[PDB]
């Protein structure tokens, strides 16, 4: 619901959704948005659909399908270099989806925008050092850049307070034509605890595990750490629920 609410942010301003201990359905998210592009790194997409991890991180932003190749850790493209970075060590599943016309409560941004370059000038005006985005972190030059970039070619500069470092921070704003249908890119990073897997896919009771299906049959019961051989019979409720 938070992903659906309001409008998707730009790739540099990507919002972060964190799920630690809840049942999750990949199919429900796929139903909400038709997935134009599906890819995963370090694990199968089917495995990601049905597995338990210590934590689930979802990053949601409005990204066009045309520049999807540029936004890759392997890719040397500027958009990945200066905007959004996904940690290589955790398995990362990257999904690009296009909003359906039927879906409502989704607001299209005026245009898709990205930080073309992020750099910091040194104390010497002649010497400049480029700044490369660390994994996530919402981008180093995001503060200078506005949430939506007004022009395809833009110059943003701000002055660092002296000590430290007293060096100008320079950012570039670039935009691409808005698609007739909003396209949103989602980056998912999953962390697995060796002894802890709190977030799990939605669980539906199997017929054999359910007491009602095996009623009237001698069976072995293992409920809440209690193990015994017994026959369950449906009857009027007695005792305290």
């Amino acid at each position, epitope marked *: 619901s938070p992903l659906l609410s309001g409008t998707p942010p730009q790739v540099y301003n990507f919002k972060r959704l964190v799920f630690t201990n809840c049942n999750y359905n990949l199919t429900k998210l796929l139903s909400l948005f038709s997935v134009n592009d599906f890819t995963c790194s370090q694990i199968s997409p089917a495995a990601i659909a049905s597995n338990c991890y210590s934590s689930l991180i979802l990053d949601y932003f409005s990204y066009p399908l045309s520049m999807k190749s540029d936004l890759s850790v392997s890719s040397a493209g500027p958009i990945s270099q200066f905007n959004y970075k996904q940690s290589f060590s955790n398995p990362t599943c990257l999904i690009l989806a296009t909003v359906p016309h039927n879906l409502t409560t989704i607001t299209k941004p005026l245009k898709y925008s990205y930080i*073309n370059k992020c*750099s910091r*000038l040194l104390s010497d*005006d002649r010497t*400049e050092v480029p700044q490369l985005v660390n994994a996530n972190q919402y981008s180093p030059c995001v503060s200078i850049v506005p949430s939506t970039v007004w*022009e395809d070619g833009d*110059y943003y500069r701000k002055q660092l307070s002296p000590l430290e470092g007293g060096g100008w921070l320079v950012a*570039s704003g670039s935009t691409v034509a808005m698609t007739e249908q909003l396209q949103m890119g989602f980056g998912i990073t999953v962390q697995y605890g060796t002894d802890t897997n709190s977030v799990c896919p939605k669980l539906e009771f199997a017929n054999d595990t359910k007491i009602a299906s095996q009623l009237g049959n001698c069976v072995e019961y293992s409920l809440y750490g209690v193990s015994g051989r017994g026959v369950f019979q449906n009857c009027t409720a007695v005792g305290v629920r």
Partner: antibody
Amino acid sequence: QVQLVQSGAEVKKPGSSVKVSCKASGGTFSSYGITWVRQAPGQGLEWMGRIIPILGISRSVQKFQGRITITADKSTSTAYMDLSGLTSDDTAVYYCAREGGSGYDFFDYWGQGTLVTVSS
Amino acid sequence: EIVLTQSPGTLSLSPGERATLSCRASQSVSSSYLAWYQQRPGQAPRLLIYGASSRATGIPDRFSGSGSGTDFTLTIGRLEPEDSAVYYCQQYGSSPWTFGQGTKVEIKR
């Protein structure tokens, strides 16, 4: 504060590439954009293009697109604009102006200027 | 690109008399996004007002900047022979930024 100077006035045939060079005295370039303005005699100034040497980005006005190539080298500390296949009517004084940024599009300092003449 | 109306231009003004220059805009432009440039004959233009309010550094407060959104007026409290020049109002709110048609102040001692 960086002083702005421009190349001496030059005369070229129409359809012949002409380069106007703007330089900063002391061979030092600050983190400021260089903007090229063409003023026709007795006419309003026209902004041909905006380039930032430190950023390395290049931008041009719609009217002057695909006929002008603008190159600014931060290390050189000199910004030079090349105009190719310009019309005879294009002859005008050319100015280079310091740019605060997209947020602040005003020019604190202006170059002395170069007269460009295109008569065969 | 915004088409902008300008003051008629050449005027006979006595020294010490306030002078007002009109810069109406056909299309609305940001109040904080306008610039005033003064050029002497055979001289490059120099910024007088940035943002249509604050004076540029090294520029006398007499050339005050007033007006917002559509009409921008440059008012000079005291007129001097040095003051006489061509004045252009540039609106940078919309790109391409459009310079003023220009207006000429004439001072005869």
